[PDB]
Design a protein around this ligand. Structure first.
Ligand SMILES: Cc1cc2nc3c(=O)[nH]c(=O)nc-3n(C[C@H](O)[C@H](O)[C@H](O)COP(=O)(O)OP(=O)(O)OC[C@H]3O[C@@H](n4cnc5c(N)ncnc54)[C@H](O)[C@@H]3O)c2cc1C
Ligand SMILES: Cc1cc2nc3c(=O)[nH]c(=O)nc-3n(C[C@H](O)[C@H](O)[C@H](O)COP(=O)(O)OP(=O)(O)OC[C@H]3O[C@@H](n4cnc5c(N)ncnc54)[C@H](O)[C@@H]3O)c2cc1C
Ligand SMILES: O=S(=O)(Nc1ccccc1Br)N1CCCC1
Lengths: 270, 270
């Protein structure tokens, strides 16, 4: 197989870059082909503009980025940095996102990466979303490093559930394009962690990569539970809503239905 | 009273730019003083790097942005462009964030604004977070335009509850720094909205601004329910933990405690 490792960190000296080195090494030792996207190292511009389109614009007087970039994608007039990335995504089976958690989401340079690269039709259409998305043959995993401890991010922690903070990312950005999201690698307290524990964290990550492809992905509501048309408002099917009135838990984090979230829905599989 | 409107949109023709203009006009007419942060117009650089620190570094050989950026702030050695922005924050009573929803969060250029601007101790401290934070006497509000419809983001919508997508930003970025967060202004389906309804959206937003400072802010679990120390793990007070065991509903979205989330916690106040 072949994997794509995307890293968002400015320092080669960091544990994030050390986590990338371990992941790249362990996967190569298993016969994977590993290609890298170190956004700071690539001089990556993370800002969507009319400059993502190479040549003449169709309608410059009222520039409309989603419509304009799709045409640019179909016509082959996207900027060479955007092109090179999209080639790597189709080529790869596994995508690992290695980044420091920053302000309760992905870093800005990675946030713009999605915006300039996950272009309409290439990555998603309203005709084929979530289970039906373009990347459904691919698996993607977040490896996150935080300042705060897992206790701060537990249900009773001051920051609130970590499952709710992962939900926009694993559901909205990854799964929406069809990715099967694997259990994230959550490395809490990085920075206040002793060098003997960082060694075991790097080794434990390499050990999980030896069978990453065989793991169960996180659970998301399959799109078949919904009437996927503009006239039904993309709501749940009435039959599906009936069968849920006597169920104790919700389905997912975003689909809690005003019910209890299944525990570690964004963190633990099965 | 003084306001700051931060806009993240590249085109002067956008509904987003019209909403910034609509907000700025109404506020001026009621005696507000309005300063703007038009990120694309300012050519804002959104990328945290060591050049955010002007002079020499404490530990250049092993750069760690949080500890050094706090020091540069304590020393007054932050990059001049970052200072200009913080001064607007100190000056502002109300902060408006006008932006198009992108990949279930803020655009990258606004993601980097937060990362380079909400520096440690200036915007948040480990000693005074949430209700005790540096911005505790200020109010902040989100104004969001989506392609997708309001039904898609309801509890039964294919995208899942909108409150869960609002939780990382309104709690983790805004309230953590101490802001009292007001009800977000949610304009769904802006790209499919008729010209006389586009007018009513603009007028209703101006009308709400005529008394914005008098609105009740959104409900968050106050930090006093917690033991905010490195020794108890920033977990809830045992007394609070006992008194919640018999509650049907959770407190907040991130603090749902495995219970039913209160309806529209991140969208409606009570
Ligand atoms: C703008 C910003 C926003 C943030 N927002 C959040 C937030 O919302 N929530 C949150 O929880 N945290 C947040 N943080 C904290 C952040 O997540 C941590 O700073 C980050 O996760 C740590 O990763 P690092 O690679 O920077 O660590 P580093 O400090 O580089 O690594 C930790 C230590 O390990 C050492 N090390 C390096 N290489 C190796 C090796 N090969 N083997 C062993 N040890 C090694 C390093 O030298 C260092 O001393 C934020 C930080 C910033 C700058
Ligand atoms: C990278 C990316 C990711 C995205 N992800 C998401 C997502 O996760 N969820 C989601 O829902 N959406 C998403 N979208 C869609 C996004 O929310 C819309 O593109 C945005 O909300 C549209 O706002 P706009 O200002 O561009 O609309 P525009 O098309 O610029 O404006 C709408 C209409 O208002 C008109 N207008 C301009 N000035 C005025 C005026 N004074 N009075 C009246 N009308 C005026 C314009 O001419 C236009 O006809 C995404 C878009 C991008 C680019
Ligand atoms: O530990 S940290 O890097 N994490 C951190 C950063 C931003 C938001 C939330 C956290 Br949590 N930091 C806190 C004050 C000193 C440096």
């Amino acid at each position: 197989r072949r994997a794509l490792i995307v890293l968002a960190h400015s320092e080669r000296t960091s544990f994030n870059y050390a986590m990338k080195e371990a992941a790249a090494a362990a996967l190569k030792k298993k016969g994977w082909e590993v290609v890298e996207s170190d956004l700071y190292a690539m001089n990556f511009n993370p800002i969507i503009s009319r400059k993502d389109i190479t040549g003449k614009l169709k309608d410059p007087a009222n520039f409309q980025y989603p419509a304009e970039s799709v045409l640019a994608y179909k016509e082959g007039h996207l900027s060479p940095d955007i092109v090179a990335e999209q080639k790597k995504l189709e080529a790869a089976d596994l995508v690992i996102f290695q980044f420091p958690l920053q302000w309760f989401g992905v870093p800005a340079i990675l946030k713009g990466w999605f915006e300039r690269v996950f272009i309409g039709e290439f990555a998603y259409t309203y005709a084929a979303m979530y289970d039906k998305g373009p990347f459904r043959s691919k698996k993607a995993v977040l490896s996150i490093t935080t300042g705060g401890s897992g206790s701060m991010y537990s249900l009773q922690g001051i920051h609130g559930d970590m499952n709710v903070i992962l939900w926009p990312i694993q559901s909205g950005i990854l799964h929406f394009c069809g990715f099967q999201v694997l259990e994230p690698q959550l490395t809490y307290s990085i920075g206040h962690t002793p060098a003997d524990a960082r060694i075991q964290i790097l080794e434990g990550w390499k050990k999980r990569l030896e069978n990453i492809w065989d793991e169960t992905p996180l659970y998301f509501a399959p799109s078949s539970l919904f009437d996927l048309n503009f006239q039904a408002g993309f709501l749940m099917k009435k039959e599906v809503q009936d069968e849920e009135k006597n169920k104790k838990f919700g389905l997912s984090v975003g689909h809690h239905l005003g019910k209890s979230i299944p525990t570690d829905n964004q963190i633990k599989a099965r």
